[PDB]
């Protein structure tokens, strides 16, 4: 009972930390920073630095499909459906369809009073791939939504439960992961889902404890391609306890000595805009000597950015429970 309240409060705490400090993670004092952050790299500039879209693809991407030219495939399929005349039942005829292997439950549902509709899929629309869908948060729901928790997706006549990824909606080549669904702008939910050709509307629901689904998002299926990459960013913070002329000695970012040597080729920066490079470890306690472009104040904090390509989790569920009828709390 009360553990739900404790988890809600902890999620609220994390949300306010994330909106106040975006990606700053404290360095673990027990595990080496070159082990917990092993699968990380540094980027000189987040927009202009390259990153191979085919690099380090998981087992999950061995199971999905990809379009060589999605624009031309949409053009071909849409011109085929508007121009060609397929020899089948034409619009308006009261037809009966015999469909092979379906459980009896739908039949029971049909004697309950539930509407049962069907639609014919376009070609290649049953194969699974990565769906990128643009959403925005409605003001009716203000509970925190964490990046990889399970949500109910209505997308183009299709209902499914899955765990998305939240990314920034920008024009760059790579997009930063949003760890929380912020309720001020439009974000991108990236998920494993069957292919659907746009336009399609995107409804996100969160299942409440009493059985109701609360609406949290609204939008359109942007694209179907796994080449879109999400980039989890971790910021390490250090304190410049000794300041010299165009020189600083920084502590508290690392604690081992070889942690400093491992993360030497990553350019550093401060909260006040001054950049710099790390020269050398001091010794045995993670202290480092760094060379900056200018003098640093005592209140300044040295920052370090680490980037890792993140991918959705395969939690595709074509079952969505039927809710209790919604009421305002």
């Amino acid at each position: 009972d009360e553990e739900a309240e404790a988890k809600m409060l902890e999620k609220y705490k994390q949300e306010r930390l994330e909106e106040m400090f975006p990606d700053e993670v404290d360095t673990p004092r027990d595990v080496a920073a070159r082990i917990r952050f092993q699968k990380y790299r540094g980027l000189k500039s987040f927009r202009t630095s390259p990153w191979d879209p085919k690099e380090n693809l998981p087992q999950d991407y061995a199971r999905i499909f990809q379009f060589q030219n999605f624009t031309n495939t949409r053009k071909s399929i849409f011109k085929e459906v508007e121009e060609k005349e397929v020899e089948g039942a034409e619009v308006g005829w009261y037809v009966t369809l015999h469909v092979s292997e379906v459980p009896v439950s739908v039949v029971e549902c049909f004697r309950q009073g539930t509407p049962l509709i069907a639609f014919s899929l376009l070609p290649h629309e049953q194969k699974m791939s990565v769906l990128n869908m643009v959403v925005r948060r409605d003001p009716g729901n203000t509970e925190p939504v964490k990046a990889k928790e399970e949500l109910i997706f209505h997308c183009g006549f299709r209902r499914f439960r899955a765990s998305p990824l939240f990314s920034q909606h920008t024009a760059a080549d790579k997009h930063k992961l949003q760890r929380f669904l912020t309720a001020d702008m439009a974000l991108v939910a990236t998920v494993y889902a069957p292919i659907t050709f746009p336009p399609a509307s995107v409804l996100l629901f969160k299942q409440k404890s009493n059985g109701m689904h609360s609406l949290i998002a609204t939008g359109h299926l942007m694209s179907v391609d796994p080449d879109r990459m999400v980039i989890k960013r971790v910021v390490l913070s250090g304190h410049p306890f000794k300041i010299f002329t165009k020189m600083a000695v920084v502590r508290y970012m690392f604690f081992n000595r070889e942690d400093v040597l491992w993360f030497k080729p990553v350019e550093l920066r401060t909260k006040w805009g001054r950049r710099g490079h790390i020269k050398e470890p001091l010794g045995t306690h993670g202290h480092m000597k760094c060379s900056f472009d200018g003098k640093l104040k005592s209140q300044d904090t040295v920052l370090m950015n680490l980037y890792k390509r993140v991918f959705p989790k395969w939690t595709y569920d074509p079952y969505v429970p039927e809710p209790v009828p919604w009421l305002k709390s």
């Binding site: 070159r34 990380y40 790299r41 540094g42 191979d52 085919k54 690099e55 380090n56 693809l57 998981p58 087992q59 991407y61 061995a62 199971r63 999905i64 499909f65 990809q66 379009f67 060589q68 030219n69 031309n72 495939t73 071909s76 290649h124 791939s129 796994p226 040597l261 491992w262 993360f263 030497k264 080729p265 990553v266 680490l306």
Partner: peptide
Amino acid sequence: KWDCESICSTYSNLYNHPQLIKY
């Protein structure tokens, strides 16, 4: 021997490619 930049030399980009649908 290895650091955070040179270790990127041992990563491959040709194993788990998804199926490519041609046009």
